RNA sequence: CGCGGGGUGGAGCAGCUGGUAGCUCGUCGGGCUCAUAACCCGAAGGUCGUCGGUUCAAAUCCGGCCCCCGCAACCA
RNA sequence: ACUAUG
RNA sequence: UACCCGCAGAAGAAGCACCGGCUAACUCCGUGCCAGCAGCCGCGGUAAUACGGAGGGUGCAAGCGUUAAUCGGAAUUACUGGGCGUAAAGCGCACGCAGGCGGUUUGUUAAGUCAGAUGUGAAAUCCCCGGGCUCAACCUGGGAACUGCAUCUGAUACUGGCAAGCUUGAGUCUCGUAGAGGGGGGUAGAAUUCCAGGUGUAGCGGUGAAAUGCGUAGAGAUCUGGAGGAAUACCGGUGGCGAAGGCGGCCCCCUGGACGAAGACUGACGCUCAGGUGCGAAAGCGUGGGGAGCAAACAGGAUUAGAUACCCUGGUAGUCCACGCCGUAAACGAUGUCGACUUGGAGGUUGUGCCCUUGAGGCGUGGCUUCCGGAGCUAACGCGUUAAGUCGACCGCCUGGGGAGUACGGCCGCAAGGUUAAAACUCAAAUGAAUUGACGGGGGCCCGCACAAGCGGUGGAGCAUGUGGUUUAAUUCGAUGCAACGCGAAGAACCUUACCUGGUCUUGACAUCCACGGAAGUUUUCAGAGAUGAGAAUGUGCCUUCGGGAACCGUGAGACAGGUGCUGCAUGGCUGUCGUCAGCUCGUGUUGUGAAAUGUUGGGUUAAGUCCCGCAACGAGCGCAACCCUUAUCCUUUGUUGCCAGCGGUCCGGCCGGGAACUCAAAGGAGACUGCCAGUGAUAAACUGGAGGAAGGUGGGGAUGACGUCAAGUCAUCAUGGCCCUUACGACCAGGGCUACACACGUGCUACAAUGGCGCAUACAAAGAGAAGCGACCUCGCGAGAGCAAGCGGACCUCAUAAAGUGCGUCGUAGUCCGGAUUGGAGUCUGCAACUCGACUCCAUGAAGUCGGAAUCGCUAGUAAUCGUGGAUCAGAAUGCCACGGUG
């Protein structure tokens, strides 16, 4: 044609910028559920 | 397409020139610049006087302006009075001693320049443009123009977009060189800028 | 961790038997078209993860370090 | 052997 | 209290909506697709009659507007009063119960129907004629009306009932004819596939071209024999039959309908049909058979950007039979069934009756069917006795587009799904026929360096120049597919100049007006880059009812100037472009409801809407053509500065007597018109050939550019509406810049060489320019040039030796005796000034380049190619631009 258009465009400007304490954790330790004889029943693998 | 100027293609066939003097190369540019100012003057003065055509020849030293006009009375004023006070401001502009003549124009309806001036006048006092055109065509055709087109152009009745209405009547053969096609032109200065007005006027052939 | 495999142009791949880095796509430049895509022509581009050894010479052989996968981590 | 879009 | 009388003073008493159209009423300012308006179309993006405000106007008016609600308009649910071929709309086709409708005649009944009478239909309301409130609303007297229902008494044409008939509608019987009508059972021949053999040898097959595929384990081709399944060439037909779906070899068995002829028989037994029942292509489903060919899915091969496709090689369900289901299709004539009436023509098919059957024939009469077309109908297309015409009976269906034939529910189904069938929400349209265009990988005819046939280039190299980008203080602004890019610019060192830097001015560099002072001018002066700022002299042109006025300069304040600032999308003018393409229109008539059409198309022909002939057209205009310039032959006149044939003389030169022939010069005329001959052709227009002619069919070249197209280009040539700046966006100056350079593109020039390079001699042009100009001769300089100096406003003189060419010598296929870029040194000229940045000369230096990828340009004859010459612009600065001849 040759019509008056009316476009838009952004600009966007943003700047740049550049371990968890053992005190803060409690650690339950306890027995597992499931399959395998005398060893599963007794020991406390699970955390 | 663009047309050749119908006066200009027909010079030294059926139209004659308007400046009809001889020069060599020293004085040619000067004569042209004089003849320009003697016309640029006599147009500005004799605006009401209805002037078709200002011929200029140069015999001897002296300059000789013929004027053609619808209204001899208003140029000659009284006892000349006006002719003679044209001469002595012309004869400055040339430099040489001058000589004004006059001719009539018997039918101002059949001169291109006067028809155009006429129409261009009416458009400045805010006349409807289709009337102004169509009067002019009728008037020429009842005084025996073999044909006539007129052509106004550009913001007509103060529109916001330009147009060019035109209006022929009879025969107007512009590729025929033999044809006498009296042609001319005028700008109306209105409040809506300019409107331009062409006018061709066939009068028969040879 | 125990065992084994892999890091190569921008992407996916080949070259790993020491002396020579290719393939398809992408990028760049030119054309064709009113224009874009396809199509035609021409040109570039790889510290071979990283550090250190061995050799006259390391993408290639050898060691450490880092990331990425796969297999194993069983009998009570 | 040609092909798509605006 | 109504009502009546007195007092005072225009006093105490006008708003609301609208003004774009519908719809009565218009202009400014603000605003700039924002804010907002809006019932619907839509308004608003810098000139808004549509927003907001103002002024004016229109309409209502103690009210005026908005919203909601009903009817209207809406014939848009149609009783009055609509439709259904293509716009929404005819069930896929039948049978048929309730229902609706029913030929003709006599009698009777009196239900419908009609007439009259009585009873009732409350009053108010409505309507009419009155009356009362000052009028009006309001109140009220009398009437009419309450279209209705019942009872009684008549009428009996129509409808109905009951009875008795009739024969034309509808049926039954008799006899024949045609038919792919249906169901079951046999059978024939051709072909494909496979199986088993014989002959035989390298391909076959397939495609646009291939490959996958088959083949030396013997394919394809060919011959013999066998198996099996499916379909029936020819006949074959806008032929036939069937309610529709449908039905196609021949034969038999069972069976349905249609039609015709003449007569006999029943006596309205009829038509239509909601719900109901049946029939119903293909695909698909179930159980069981079969399986040649074909072939959804699927596989591989191609094609392609991809190719889940079109094409190829294979291939399973399916297609086939039996018995069940499914119930749908553009199941279409997109046209429900039945009946009646209303001009014609051409056919086909099947009966039948009359006729020297005398002929495959002449004259009629039924049935079914194809194509034209009249009246009429229809929005139009079309339909048109087989209606979509004129009527009647019954049924089905439609009520904007999407949502959606969908969801939910019901019914049917083995399933797939069918059938019935909504609403919210959303848009202001969606749709039909016809018209003008434009478009088509639709068709036909015709053109053009469009292709083909050819010759030469561009794209690669170095330079010139323009453009983009990048850079810069600035690289001024514009032109951007064809139709910008050696374009504006026919010529940027300063100027130009519009840009940057710094330095200056403010009624101004430029113009008009008034005021006051000085005749204009001349001449050096020191600062400063320059603009600019501080000094000596000099007349008095001119008239003076003598004031000064006029020529011209500075100073003064304001009206103003100024602006290459913005908008080419507000404009004029001018230009490019399709395109020198043959087209583009009008008037009056006519056709059509109309947009429109016709003319303008058709048959010939032309370069041409050129010309002829036709034809509801007849004419006209703009274009084509011609009229104009130039070139090609001749004639007439006129001969200097041009010319020299025949004459004399010579310094051998048209140079000097002379000549007026010839070339040439530039005025005036002649000549070319299909004019003449033959043939072709509708006796036409024209075409093909021939003659004479310098030229022949528009002889060659230019100028000439229709209506219009692209909001094409240009506000920076000029003009111009509006906006903008006005101690700056105006104005003056010096220096810089427009010439920058990692790059990319355009247009040119020069090359890469023996058709050539260098050296020496030697021939034949045209067209131009010239006074602040062209500049000879002679002298100086290697040269560019310099010094001196005739001539020439120019057929006289100068620029000015044309070069390719030709002859003789030389180089030997080499990055060269090809090529000239680049750089160093030294000059010349123009110019106040060549650093940035001119051209030319001399000496030296001697890059790239060995004929250019994809691609791409120009040209049909004095053309292309190649060779020089001149001009405008211009102080100087042409490889560009415009022009000229040579060879060809």
UniProtKB/Swiss-Prot annotation, chain A:
Sequence motif: GGQ motif, positions: 36-38
Effect of substituting residue 38 to A: No change in complex formation with TnaC-stalled 70S ribosomes
Record annotation: effect of changing residue 38 to E: Loss of methylation. No longer allows ArfA to rescue stalled ribosomes
Record PTM text: Methylated by PrmC. Methylation increases the termination efficiency of RF2. Is absent when the factor is overproduced.
Residue runs in coiled coils: none
Source species, domain of life: Bacteria
Compartment list: Cytoplasm
N5-methylglutamine: residues bearing it: 38
Subunit structure: Interacts with the ribosome. Recruited to stalled ribosomes by ArfA, in the presence of truncated mRNA, ArfA influences RF2 conformation so RF2 can hydrolyze the peptidyl-tRNA bond. Biotinylated tnaC mRNA can be detected in a stalled 70S ribosome-RF2-TnaC-tRNA(Pro) complex.
Additional observations: This provides a mechanism for the protein to regulate its own production.
Function: Peptide chain release factor 2 directs the termination of translation in response to the peptide chain termination codons UGA and UAA. Acts as a peptidyl-tRNA hydrolase. In the presence of truncated mRNA in the 70S ribosome, ArfA and RF2 interact such that the GGQ peptide hydrolysis motif of RF2 rises into the peptidyl-transferase center (PTC) and releases the ribosome. Recruited by ArfA to rescue stalled ribosomes in the absence of a normal stop codon. A TnaC-stalled ribosome binds RF2, but the active GGQ motif is prevented from engaging with the PTC by TnaC.
Family as reported in the entry's similarity comment: Belongs to the prokaryotic/mitochondrial release factor family.
Protein name: Peptide chain release factor RF2
Protein's organism: Escherichia coli (strain K12)
UniProtKB/Swiss-Prot annotation, chain B:
Location of the KH type-2 domain: 38-106
GO cellular component, one term: cytosolic small ribosomal subunit
UniProt keyword terms in alphabetical order: Ribonucleoprotein, Ribosomal protein, RNA-binding, rRNA-binding
PROSITE patterns given in the database record: KH_TYPE_2, RIBOSOMAL_S3
Signal peptide: none
Gene3D superfamilies, sorted: 3.30.300.20, Ribosomal protein S3, C-terminal domain
Name under which the protein is recorded: Small ribosomal subunit protein uS3
């Amino acid at each position: 044609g040759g019509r008056r258009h009316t476009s838009f465009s952004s600009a966007f400007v943003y700047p740049e910028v550049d371990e968890i304490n053992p005190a803060d954790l409690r650690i339950d330790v306890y027995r597992t559920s499931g399959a395998g004889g005398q060893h599963v029943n007794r020991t406390e693998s699970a955390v | 397409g663009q047309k050749v100027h119908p006066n200009g293609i027909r010079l030294g066939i059926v139209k004659p020139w308007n400046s009809t003097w001889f020069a060599n190369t020293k004085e040619f540019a000067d004569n042209l610049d004089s003849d320009f100012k003697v016309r640029q003057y006599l147009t500005k003065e004799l605006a009401k006087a209805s002037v078709s055509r200002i011929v200029i020849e140069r015999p001897a030293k002296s300059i000789r302006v013929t004027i053609h006009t619808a209204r001899p009375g208003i140029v000659i004023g009284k006892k000349g009075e006006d002719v003679e006070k044209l001469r002595k401001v012309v004869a400055d502009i040339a430099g040489v001693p001058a000589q004004i003549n006059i001719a009539e124009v018997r039918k101002p309806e059949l001169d291109a320049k006067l028809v155009a001036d006429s129409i261009t006048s009416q458009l400045e006092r805010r006349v409807m443009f289709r009337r102004a055109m169509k009067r002019a065509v009728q008037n020429a055709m009842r005084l025996g123009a073999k044909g006539i087109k007129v052509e106004v152009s550009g913001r007509l009745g103060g529109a916001e977009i330009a147009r060019t209405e035109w209006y022929r009547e009879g025969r107007v053969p512009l590729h025929t060189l033999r044809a006498d096609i009296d042609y001319n032109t005028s700008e109306a200065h209105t409040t809506y800028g300019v409107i331009g007005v062409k006018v061709w006027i066939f009068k028969g052939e040879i």
